[PDB]
Design a protein around this ligand. Structure first.
Ligand SMILES: [Mg+2]
Ligand SMILES: [Mg+2]
Ligand SMILES: [Mg+2]
Ligand SMILES: [Mg+2]
Ligand SMILES: [Mg+2]
Ligand SMILES: [Mg+2]
Ligand SMILES: [Mg+2]
Ligand SMILES: [Mg+2]
Ligand SMILES: [Mg+2]
Ligand SMILES: [Mg+2]
Ligand SMILES: [Mg+2]
Ligand SMILES: [Mg+2]
Ligand SMILES: [Mg+2]
Ligand SMILES: [Mg+2]
Ligand SMILES: [Mg+2]
Ligand SMILES: [Mg+2]
Ligand SMILES: [Mg+2]
Ligand SMILES: [Mg+2]
Ligand SMILES: [Mg+2]
Ligand SMILES: [Mg+2]
Ligand SMILES: [Mg+2]
Ligand SMILES: [Mg+2]
Ligand SMILES: [Mg+2]
Ligand SMILES: [Mg+2]
Ligand SMILES: [Mg+2]
Ligand SMILES: [Mg+2]
Ligand SMILES: [Mg+2]
Ligand SMILES: [Mg+2]
Ligand SMILES: [Mg+2]
Ligand SMILES: [Mg+2]
Ligand SMILES: [Mg+2]
Ligand SMILES: [Mg+2]
Ligand SMILES: [Mg+2]
Ligand SMILES: [Mg+2]
Ligand SMILES: [Mg+2]
Ligand SMILES: [Mg+2]
Ligand SMILES: [Mg+2]
Ligand SMILES: [Mg+2]
Ligand SMILES: [Mg+2]
Ligand SMILES: [Mg+2]
Ligand SMILES: [Mg+2]
Ligand SMILES: [Zn+2]
Lengths: 55, 165, 98, 63, 43, 102
RNA sequence: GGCACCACCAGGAGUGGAGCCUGCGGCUUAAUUUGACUCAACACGGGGAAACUCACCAGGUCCAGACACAAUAAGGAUUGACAGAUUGAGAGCUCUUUCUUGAUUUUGUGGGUGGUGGUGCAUGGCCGUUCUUAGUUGGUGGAGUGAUUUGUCUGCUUAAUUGCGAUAACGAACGAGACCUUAACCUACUAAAUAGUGCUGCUAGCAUUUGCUGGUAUAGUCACUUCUUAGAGGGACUAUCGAUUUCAAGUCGAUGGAAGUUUGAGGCAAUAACAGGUCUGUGAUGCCCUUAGACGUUCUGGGCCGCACGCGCGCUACACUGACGGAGCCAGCGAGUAUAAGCCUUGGCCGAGAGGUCUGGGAAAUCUUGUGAAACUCCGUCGUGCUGGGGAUAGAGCAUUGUAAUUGUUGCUCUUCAACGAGGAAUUCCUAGUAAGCGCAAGUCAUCAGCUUGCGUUGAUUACGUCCCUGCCCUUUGUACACACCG
């Protein structure tokens, strides 16, 4: 009944199908190399992940 | 499972970033400095640097044992595949992480900013730092916010050496 | 929350014996992968326990880190009617390494 | 739309009295054609609703 | 610290905290029945 | 399962430890009379990510350009399988991972 | 005084003029969510929204209100429910309906918790701007009762407070420069069966001279590192020689050199500051609002695209230095998957196409891939004509993705074939592999790139000067301002 309606809409292959690892966001996601992080969350973790600015 | 070379090195990096913040939230009060992940055959050595190595292994190492179990249950690691060691930072004054966390525990005690700020300027130099500068920004009883700067000694600003020293 | 007594039990014999619990933030997940019940049941059951000072809760990167207080071993000692030989698994006095 | 009210449980006060009868100096009566599904069995009775009989454990109706 | 005081009595008070803590910490370094079984004994 | 043409693949982000492990293995493959091929410098892979600087949407359109380098080297050895594995444990380095395929 | 293509000069390409794409305002709306308004708002919020995203609109569910109490409560506090009515709905949402579960829980009190609700004028962090301009600071000494000042300057020079020099200053620090990354050189080392080559086995075609083009080769268990890759080094320091100059810092010419504009390009980047922008990135936050008829969250449908209009970032073009039609046929930067939830996809076979199908390769210098790309070149048709330029608008039909394409996602086929005949006042960008064309890859991404971030192909005209406009810095000056002219 309700369990068959609650959260019933498909939530795959979409922008709402995925989220940031750190800030559960839907906008500004980075999917390269399987990061799955918001673009804002990436900046605050880039040094920790191993991404540095050289050029 | 089968992970490409480009994504596998990234996954190891992503693992470090998420693990480091977990320690920052849990072991903030023990002057957590940083973490070193020493991969090895048949074991995953993890080295945590903290100001206080009594908290991290409390009550017959209750905390480190109950804390290493929290990592086996979240990353689906074998129970024997990870071992956590707590190592003392030798020179606390040269670690800005310890000095900033130490500052937080004093500011939250209602202590004046000036007493807290001069407490880290002199503590860093005593450990032998070439220079140190502390900036504190925010609101304190007053509605308007302000930022203060206490410099000391020699500080460099531009180029590669800021990433080195 | 309305949890069957049996599903609440499995949450307690996972928290005791490995006095730490990790839960991903998804409410509609069928199985918390360690406790054969809904993942949401684990979050709300332990939100009460941390609400009543029996477990500490830490949250980082959309993950829950539940750890059992020393006060909580005594609580499950009596309510679960378990033998008074406790030592969940974290409190096995395994001791660290120097 | 007008404000709605959620449904509230409606007993009978001892609904169970009607499920059994006692023959003077007897044995069990078994009045409400207990469900034959493996889920239920004894103690789970059908429902003398109308042109159907419902058991609450496994949601099924008869005739 | 918006005054000639509370930073004066902030410096000498701030610095004596570290000297006491550097020395205390540098001295701190110079010196430094199971369960599942009970669930199975129902034989 | 005796002598074996064996390939060892080395990948890491940092070249100093990669070349030390690479040189240490070549050194240990010298005093031991083994025949070897390498090290072979594979084309380095530049993992580049270009984001916007602004967390919000205001200002001059300024971008970060983060970088990651993956250097991969493969060395071919002609030795029995038992011998090569103990060389790996001798020249174990936390940063560099090793995969060995026959 | 000085510097500067976000200023000009000499010039190039343009934009503004047309159509369309897209953003902003406005109007409209049931809602057309919202931030941003000169540079520093308007292809910006990585904002290319069919659902989600989503915050808006019209409706419909759930508590996922922890916890201490109090009440109710096993003689049952409460939860799930077939069938029919009801509903957009096979939502027990609600109503008839009696079945089921069992102290988990229902009601009241406090207390919570959650908000893309408000406040960026309460804040953290981050970011943009003054400004990447060249500026900033202290010790000792001189001056001053002092706040302060000199040092930090007439001149020359430089990209530069960067140097020469003058000198009540002398000797220094941040910033600049140094530093880091990338591109160009090394037949000198180090090696490479995931790179390439000559020989050599074996092999094809053509002329027969033994030659020229190929294929094969993971055992030829060959030779080599020039081309390819990348680590250790080397190499440029304005070197030598001419001119000028205070004979100083330097500058301009030659010669050598791979490189002689800081060798080219970037990354980092000082003292302060702005009510600059974000609480619509955050399980970052203070406070206010809301919290069961929710502003939480979820389902269905619509909207963010809506159209008498003004403005900004762009794409096709207005033709012949061209359109087509055949033929020739060269890059670089990169990415790529598993019991998934499906990646990059060659090769074969169908189909005019779009596309479909069967196998195989590749977690990758191995396979897609030499990404055989486009401008471009050769030969033809066209022949100054709103023409074969241009391809909107629209009709009919064929495929792909997706639950779902209607307000056409996109692609293909035929047909229709509009403005536009080089654009007023204005205004933008730019100095060498630069501008301009021309495409390709990566991000977004189930599908959609007229967008950005990069990459390479073809490849110039015209300066290498100045303060005339514009902006900024310095010096002098005035000041009744210091919340500093938003006075
Ligand atoms: Mg205080
Ligand atoms: Mg420096
Ligand atoms: Mg520099
Ligand atoms: Mg987090
Ligand atoms: Mg001009
Ligand atoms: Mg714009
Ligand atoms: Mg939608
Ligand atoms: Mg919806
Ligand atoms: Mg919402
Ligand atoms: Mg929030
Ligand atoms: Mg701010
Ligand atoms: Mg002085
Ligand atoms: Mg003086
Ligand atoms: Mg004096
Ligand atoms: Mg200077
Ligand atoms: Mg071979
Ligand atoms: Mg440079
Ligand atoms: Mg502001
Ligand atoms: Mg503002
Ligand atoms: Mg937004
Ligand atoms: Mg609602
Ligand atoms: Mg809301
Ligand atoms: Mg919409
Ligand atoms: Mg829009
Ligand atoms: Mg519309
Ligand atoms: Mg722009
Ligand atoms: Mg154009
Ligand atoms: Mg042609
Ligand atoms: Mg290739
Ligand atoms: Mg052509
Ligand atoms: Mg025509
Ligand atoms: Mg045409
Ligand atoms: Mg057309
Ligand atoms: Mg003209
Ligand atoms: Mg102009
Ligand atoms: Mg202009
Ligand atoms: Mg779309
Ligand atoms: Mg694309
Ligand atoms: Mg865009
Ligand atoms: Mg002027
Ligand atoms: Mg004055
Ligand atoms: Zn995020």
């Amino acid at each position: 009944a309700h369990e068959n309606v609650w959260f019933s809409h498909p939530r795959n292959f979409g922008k709402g199908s995925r989220q940031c690892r750190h800030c559960s966001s839907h906008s500004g996601l980075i999917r390269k190399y399987g990061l799955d992080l918001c673009r804002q969350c990436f900046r605050e973790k880039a040094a920790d992940i191993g991404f540095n600015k050289y050029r | 499972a089968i992970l490409s070379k480009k994504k596998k090195l990234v996954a190891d990096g992503v693992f470090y970033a998420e693990l480091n913040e977990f320690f920052t939230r849990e072991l903030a009060e023990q002057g957590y400095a940083g973490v070193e992940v020493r991969k090895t055959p048949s074991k995953l050595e993890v080295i945590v640097k903290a100001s206080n190595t009594q908290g991290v292994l409390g009550e017959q190492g209750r905390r480190i044992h109950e804390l290493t179990s929290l990592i086996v249950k979240r990353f689906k690691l074998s129970p024997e595949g990870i071992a956590i060691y707590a190592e003392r930072v030798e020179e606390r004054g040269l670690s800005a992480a310890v000095q900033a966390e130490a500052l937080k525990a004093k500011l939250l005690s209602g202590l004046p900013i000036r007493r807290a700020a001069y407490g880290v300027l002199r503590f860093a130099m005593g450990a032998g730092a070439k220079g140190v500068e502390v900036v504190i920004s925010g609101k304190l009883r007053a509605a308007r916010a302000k930022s203060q700067k206490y410099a000391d000694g020699f500080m460099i600003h531009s180029g590669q050496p800021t990433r080195d020293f | 929350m309305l949890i069957p007594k049996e599903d609440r039990k499995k949450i307690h014999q996972y928290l005791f014996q490995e006095g730490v619990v990790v839960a991903k933030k998804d409410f509609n997940q069928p199985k918390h992968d360690e406790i054969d019940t809904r993942n949401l049941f684990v979050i709300k059951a332990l939100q009460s326990l941390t609400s009543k000072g029996y477990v500490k809760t830490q949250f980082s990167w959309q993950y829950y880190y539940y750890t059992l207080t020393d006060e909580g071993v005594e609580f499950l000692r009596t309510e679960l009617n378990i033998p008074e030989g406790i030592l969940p698994l974290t409190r096995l006095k395994n001791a660290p390494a120097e | 739309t007008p404000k709605k009210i959620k449904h509230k449980h409606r007993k009978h006060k001892l609904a169970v009295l009607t499920y059994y009868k006692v023959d003077n100096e007897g044995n069990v009566e078994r009045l409400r054609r207990e469900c034959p599904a493996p889920t239920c069995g004894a103690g789970i009775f059908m429902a003398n609703m109308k042109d159907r009989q419902y058991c609450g454990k496994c949601h099924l109706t008869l005739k | 610290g918006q005054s000639d005081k509370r930073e004066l009595e902030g410096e000498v008070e701030g610095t004596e905290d570290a000297e006491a803590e550097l020395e205390a910490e540098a001295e701190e370094n110079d010196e430094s029945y199971l369960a599942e079984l009970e669930l199975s004994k129902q034989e | 399962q005796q002598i074996h043409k064996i390939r060892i693949t080395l990948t890491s982000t940092k070249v100093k430890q990669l070349e030390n492990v690479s040189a240490n293995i070549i050194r240990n493959a010298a005093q031991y009379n083994i025949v070897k091929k390498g090290p072979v410098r594979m084309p380095t892979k530049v993992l580049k990510i270009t984001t916007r600087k602004t967390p919000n949407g205001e200002g001059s359109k300024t971008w970060d350009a983060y970088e990651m380098r993956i250097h991969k080297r493969v060395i071919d050895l002609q030795a029995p399988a038992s011998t090569v594995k103990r060389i790996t444990q001798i020249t174990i380095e936390p940063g560099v991972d090793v995969e060995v395929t026959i």
